[PDB]
Coordinates of N, CA, C and O in Angstrom, one line a residue:
Chain A
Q30 N 43.4 55.5 -59.7 CA 43.5 54.7 -58.5 C 42.3 54.7 -57.6 O 41.5 55.6 -57.6
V31 N 42.1 53.6 -56.9 CA 41.0 53.5 -55.9 C 41.3 54.2 -54.6 O 42.5 54.4 -54.3
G32 N 40.3 54.7 -53.9 CA 40.5 55.4 -52.7 C 40.9 54.6 -51.5 O 40.4 53.6 -51.2
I33 N 42.0 55.2 -50.8 CA 42.5 54.6 -49.6 C 41.6 54.6 -48.4 O 41.0 55.6 -48.1
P34 N 41.4 53.4 -47.7 CA 40.4 53.3 -46.6 C 40.9 54.2 -45.5 O 42.0 54.3 -45.1
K35 N 39.9 54.9 -44.8 CA 40.2 55.9 -43.8 C 40.9 55.2 -42.6 O 41.7 55.9 -41.9
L36 N 40.5 54.0 -42.2 CA 41.1 53.3 -41.1 C 42.6 52.9 -41.5 O 43.4 52.7 -40.6
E37 N 42.8 52.7 -42.7 CA 44.2 52.2 -43.2 C 45.3 53.2 -42.9 O 46.4 52.9 -42.7
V38 N 45.0 54.5 -43.0 CA 45.9 55.6 -42.7 C 45.7 56.3 -41.4 O 44.7 56.2 -40.8
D39 N 46.7 57.1 -41.0 CA 46.7 57.7 -39.6 C 45.9 59.0 -39.5 O 45.7 59.5 -38.4
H40 N 45.5 59.6 -40.7 CA 44.8 60.9 -40.7 C 43.4 60.8 -40.0 O 42.7 59.8 -40.3
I41 N 43.1 61.8 -39.2 CA 41.7 62.0 -38.8 C 40.8 62.6 -39.9 O 41.3 63.5 -40.6
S42 N 39.6 62.2 -40.0 CA 38.7 62.7 -41.1 C 37.3 63.0 -40.5 O 36.7 62.1 -39.9
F43 N 36.8 64.2 -40.6 CA 35.6 64.6 -39.9 C 34.3 64.7 -40.7 O 33.3 65.3 -40.3
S44 N 34.3 64.1 -41.9 CA 33.1 63.9 -42.6 C 33.1 62.5 -43.2 O 34.1 62.1 -43.8
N45 N 32.0 61.8 -42.9 CA 32.0 60.4 -43.3 C 30.5 59.9 -43.6 O 29.6 60.6 -43.2
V46 N 30.4 58.9 -44.5 CA 29.0 58.4 -44.8 C 28.5 57.3 -43.9 O 29.0 56.2 -43.9
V47 N 27.6 57.7 -43.0 CA 27.0 56.8 -42.0 C 25.7 56.3 -42.5 O 24.8 57.1 -42.8
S48 N 25.5 55.0 -42.6 CA 24.3 54.4 -42.9 C 23.3 54.5 -41.7 O 23.8 54.4 -40.6
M49 N 22.0 54.6 -41.9 CA 21.1 54.8 -40.9 C 19.7 54.4 -41.3 O 19.3 54.6 -42.4
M50 N 18.9 53.9 -40.4 CA 17.5 53.7 -40.6 C 16.7 55.0 -40.7 O 17.0 55.9 -39.9
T51 N 15.8 55.1 -41.6 CA 15.0 56.3 -41.8 C 14.1 56.7 -40.6 O 13.8 57.9 -40.4
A52 N 13.7 55.7 -39.9 CA 12.9 55.9 -38.7 C 13.0 54.7 -37.8 O 13.7 53.7 -38.1
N53 N 12.5 54.8 -36.6 CA 12.8 53.8 -35.5 C 12.4 52.4 -35.8 O 11.3 52.1 -36.3
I54 N 13.4 51.5 -35.6 CA 13.2 50.1 -35.8 C 12.2 49.4 -35.0 O 11.5 48.4 -35.4
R55 N 12.0 49.9 -33.7 CA 11.1 49.3 -32.8 C 9.7 49.9 -33.0 O 9.2 50.8 -32.2
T56 N 9.0 49.4 -34.0 CA 7.6 49.9 -34.4 C 6.6 49.7 -33.2 O 5.6 50.4 -33.1
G57 N 6.8 48.6 -32.4 CA 5.9 48.3 -31.3 C 5.0 47.2 -31.6 O 4.2 46.8 -30.7
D58 N 5.0 46.6 -32.8 CA 4.2 45.4 -33.1 C 5.0 44.1 -32.7 O 5.5 43.4 -33.6
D59 N 5.3 43.9 -31.4 CA 6.0 42.8 -31.0 C 5.3 41.5 -31.2 O 4.1 41.4 -31.1
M60 N 6.1 40.4 -31.6 CA 5.5 39.1 -32.0 C 4.9 38.4 -30.8 O 5.4 38.5 -29.7
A61 N 3.8 37.8 -31.1 CA 3.0 37.0 -30.1 C 2.6 35.7 -30.7 O 2.3 35.7 -31.9
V62 N 2.4 34.7 -29.9 CA 2.1 33.4 -30.5 C 1.0 32.6 -29.7 O 0.7 32.9 -28.6
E63 N 0.5 31.6 -30.4 CA -0.6 30.8 -29.9 C 0.1 29.5 -29.5 O 0.2 28.5 -30.3
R64 N 0.6 29.4 -28.3 CA 1.0 28.1 -27.7 C -0.2 27.3 -27.5 O -1.2 27.7 -26.9
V65 N -0.1 26.0 -27.9 CA -1.2 25.1 -27.6 C -0.5 23.8 -27.1 O 0.4 23.2 -27.6
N66 N -1.0 23.4 -25.9 CA -0.5 22.3 -25.1 C -0.8 20.9 -25.7 O -1.7 20.8 -26.5
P67 N 0.1 19.9 -25.3 CA -0.3 18.5 -25.7 C -1.6 18.2 -25.0 O -1.9 18.6 -23.9
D68 N -2.4 17.4 -25.7 CA -3.8 17.1 -25.2 C -3.7 16.2 -23.9 O -4.4 16.5 -22.9
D69 N -2.9 15.1 -24.0 CA -2.8 14.2 -22.9 C -1.3 13.9 -22.7 O -0.6 13.5 -23.6
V70 N -0.9 14.1 -21.4 CA 0.6 14.0 -21.1 C 1.1 12.6 -21.3 O 2.3 12.4 -21.6
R71 N 0.3 11.6 -21.1 CA 0.7 10.2 -21.2 C 1.0 9.8 -22.7 O 1.9 9.0 -22.9
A72 N 0.3 10.5 -23.6 CA 0.4 10.1 -25.0 C 1.6 10.8 -25.7 O 1.9 10.4 -26.9
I73 N 2.3 11.7 -25.0 CA 3.4 12.4 -25.6 C 4.6 11.5 -26.0 O 5.0 10.6 -25.3
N74 N 5.1 11.8 -27.2 CA 6.2 10.9 -27.7 C 7.6 11.5 -27.3 O 8.2 12.3 -28.1
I75 N 8.1 11.1 -26.2 CA 9.5 11.5 -25.8 C 10.5 10.9 -26.7 O 11.5 11.6 -27.0
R76 N 10.2 9.8 -27.3 CA 11.2 9.0 -28.1 C 11.6 9.6 -29.4 O 11.2 10.8 -29.7
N77 N 12.4 8.9 -30.1 CA 12.9 9.4 -31.4 C 13.6 10.7 -31.4 O 13.1 11.7 -31.9
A78 N 14.9 10.7 -30.8 CA 15.7 11.9 -30.8 C 14.9 13.1 -30.2 O 14.0 12.9 -29.4
Chain B
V25 N -12.1 20.2 -51.4 CA -11.2 19.4 -50.6 C -12.0 18.5 -49.6 O -12.8 19.0 -48.9
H26 N -11.7 17.2 -49.6 CA -12.3 16.3 -48.7 C -11.3 16.1 -47.5 O -10.7 15.1 -47.4
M27 N -11.1 17.2 -46.7 CA -10.1 17.1 -45.7 C -10.5 16.1 -44.6 O -11.7 16.1 -44.1
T28 N -9.5 15.4 -44.1 CA -9.8 14.4 -43.1 C -8.9 14.6 -41.8 O -7.8 14.3 -41.8
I29 N -9.6 15.2 -40.8 CA -8.9 15.6 -39.6 C -8.9 14.4 -38.6 O -9.8 14.1 -37.9
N30 N -7.8 13.6 -38.6 CA -7.6 12.5 -37.7 C -7.6 12.9 -36.3 O -8.0 12.1 -35.4
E31 N -7.1 14.0 -36.0 CA -6.9 14.5 -34.6 C -6.8 16.0 -34.5 O -5.9 16.6 -35.1
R32 N -7.8 16.6 -33.9 CA -7.9 18.1 -33.8 C -6.8 18.7 -32.9 O -6.6 19.9 -32.9
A33 N -6.2 17.9 -32.1 CA -5.2 18.4 -31.1 C -4.0 19.1 -31.7 O -3.4 18.7 -32.7
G34 N -3.7 20.3 -31.2 CA -2.5 21.1 -31.6 C -2.9 22.1 -32.7 O -2.1 23.0 -33.0
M35 N -4.1 22.0 -33.2 CA -4.6 22.9 -34.3 C -4.8 24.3 -33.8 O -5.3 24.5 -32.7
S36 N -4.3 25.3 -34.5 CA -4.6 26.7 -34.2 C -6.1 26.9 -34.4 O -6.7 26.5 -35.3
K37 N -6.7 27.7 -33.4 CA -8.1 28.0 -33.5 C -8.5 28.8 -34.7 O -9.5 28.6 -35.3
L38 N -7.6 29.6 -35.1 CA -7.7 30.4 -36.4 C -7.7 29.5 -37.6 O -8.4 29.7 -38.6
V39 N -6.9 28.4 -37.5 CA -6.9 27.4 -38.6 C -8.2 26.7 -38.6 O -8.7 26.4 -39.7
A40 N -8.8 26.5 -37.5 CA -10.1 25.8 -37.4 C -11.2 26.7 -38.0 O -12.0 26.2 -38.8
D41 N -11.2 28.0 -37.7 CA -12.1 28.9 -38.3 C -11.9 29.0 -39.8 O -12.8 29.1 -40.6
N42 N -10.6 28.8 -40.2 CA -10.4 28.9 -41.7 C -10.9 27.7 -42.4 O -11.4 27.7 -43.5
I43 N -10.8 26.5 -41.7 CA -11.3 25.3 -42.3 C -12.8 25.3 -42.4 O -13.3 24.9 -43.5
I44 N -13.5 25.8 -41.4 CA -14.9 25.8 -41.4 C -15.3 26.8 -42.5 O -16.3 26.6 -43.3
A45 N -14.6 27.9 -42.6 CA -14.9 29.0 -43.6 C -14.6 28.4 -45.0 O -15.2 29.0 -45.9
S46 N -13.8 27.4 -45.1 CA -13.6 26.8 -46.3 C -14.7 25.8 -46.6 O -15.1 25.7 -47.8
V47 N -15.3 25.2 -45.6 CA -16.4 24.4 -45.8 C -17.5 25.2 -46.4 O -18.3 24.7 -47.2
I48 N -17.6 26.4 -45.9 CA -18.7 27.3 -46.3 C -18.5 28.0 -47.7 O -19.4 27.9 -48.5
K49 N -17.4 28.6 -47.9 CA -17.1 29.4 -49.0 C -16.5 28.7 -50.2 O -16.5 29.1 -51.3
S50 N -15.8 27.6 -49.9 CA -15.2 26.7 -51.0 C -15.9 25.4 -51.1 O -15.4 24.5 -51.9
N51 N -16.9 25.1 -50.3 CA -17.6 23.8 -50.2 C -16.7 22.7 -49.9 O -16.8 21.6 -50.4
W52 N -15.8 22.9 -48.9 CA -15.0 21.8 -48.4 C -15.9 20.8 -47.7 O -17.0 21.2 -47.2
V53 N -15.5 19.5 -47.8 CA -16.1 18.5 -46.9 C -15.1 18.0 -46.0 O -14.2 17.3 -46.4
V54 N -15.1 18.5 -44.7 CA -14.1 18.1 -43.8 C -14.6 17.0 -42.8 O -15.6 17.2 -42.2
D55 N -13.8 15.9 -42.7 CA -14.2 14.8 -41.9 C -13.4 14.6 -40.6 O -12.4 13.9 -40.6
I56 N -14.0 15.1 -39.5 CA -13.3 15.0 -38.2 C -13.5 13.7 -37.5 O -14.6 13.4 -37.0
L57 N -12.5 12.8 -37.5 CA -12.6 11.5 -37.0 C -12.4 11.3 -35.5 O -12.8 10.3 -34.9
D58 N -11.9 12.4 -34.9 CA -11.6 12.3 -33.4 C -12.9 12.2 -32.6 O -12.9 11.6 -31.5
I59 N -14.0 12.9 -33.1 CA -15.2 13.1 -32.3 C -16.0 11.8 -31.9 O -16.2 10.9 -32.7
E60 N -16.4 11.8 -30.7 CA -17.4 10.8 -30.2 C -18.7 11.5 -29.8 O -18.6 12.5 -29.1
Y61 N -19.8 11.0 -30.2 CA -21.1 11.7 -29.9 C -22.2 10.7 -29.8 O -22.3 9.7 -30.5
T62 N -23.1 11.0 -28.8 CA -24.4 10.4 -28.7 C -25.4 11.1 -29.7 O -25.1 12.2 -30.1
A63 N -26.4 10.4 -30.1 CA -27.4 11.1 -31.0 C -28.8 10.8 -30.6 O -29.2 9.7 -30.1
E64 N -29.7 11.8 -30.7 CA -31.1 11.7 -30.4 C -31.9 12.0 -31.6 O -31.7 13.1 -32.2
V65 N -32.7 11.1 -32.1 CA -33.6 11.4 -33.3 C -34.9 12.1 -32.9 O -35.9 11.4 -32.5
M66 N -34.9 13.4 -32.9 CA -36.0 14.2 -32.6 C -37.1 14.1 -33.6 O -36.8 14.0 -34.8
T67 N -38.4 14.1 -33.2 CA -39.5 14.1 -34.1 C -39.8 15.5 -34.6 O -39.4 16.5 -34.0
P68 N -40.4 15.6 -35.8 CA -40.7 16.9 -36.4 C -41.5 17.8 -35.5 O -41.4 19.0 -35.5
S69 N -42.4 17.1 -34.7 CA -43.3 17.9 -33.9 C -42.5 18.7 -32.8 O -42.8 19.8 -32.5
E70 N -41.4 18.1 -32.3 CA -40.7 18.7 -31.1 C -39.6 19.6 -31.6 O -39.3 20.6 -30.9
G71 N -39.0 19.3 -32.7 CA -37.9 20.2 -33.2 C -36.6 20.0 -32.5 O -36.6 19.2 -31.6
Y72 N -35.6 20.7 -32.9 CA -34.3 20.7 -32.2 C -34.4 21.4 -30.9 O -35.2 22.4 -30.7
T73 N -33.6 21.0 -29.9 CA -33.6 21.7 -28.6 C -32.1 22.1 -28.3 O -31.9 23.2 -27.7

């Protein structure tokens, strides 16, 4: 038979397998971008959806 | 590659450096059509300024 899920029954259980990252997720290399503006505001195409 | 840049606007500066570096190391011929320029025909005696 397969094992009964721990949430499915009323028993408390004090040892469990917890997944975890081996080291911190926030490495500190936050993403940064090169925004570049439209050259001329009059030429911008508002149209087409 | 005979790349033809109809309009430089919006281009990443790093992409520009890459394209020039392609002109140099892969012998690209890139044709920038956006540019307008005056020209002066200097004599050999005077050289470029």
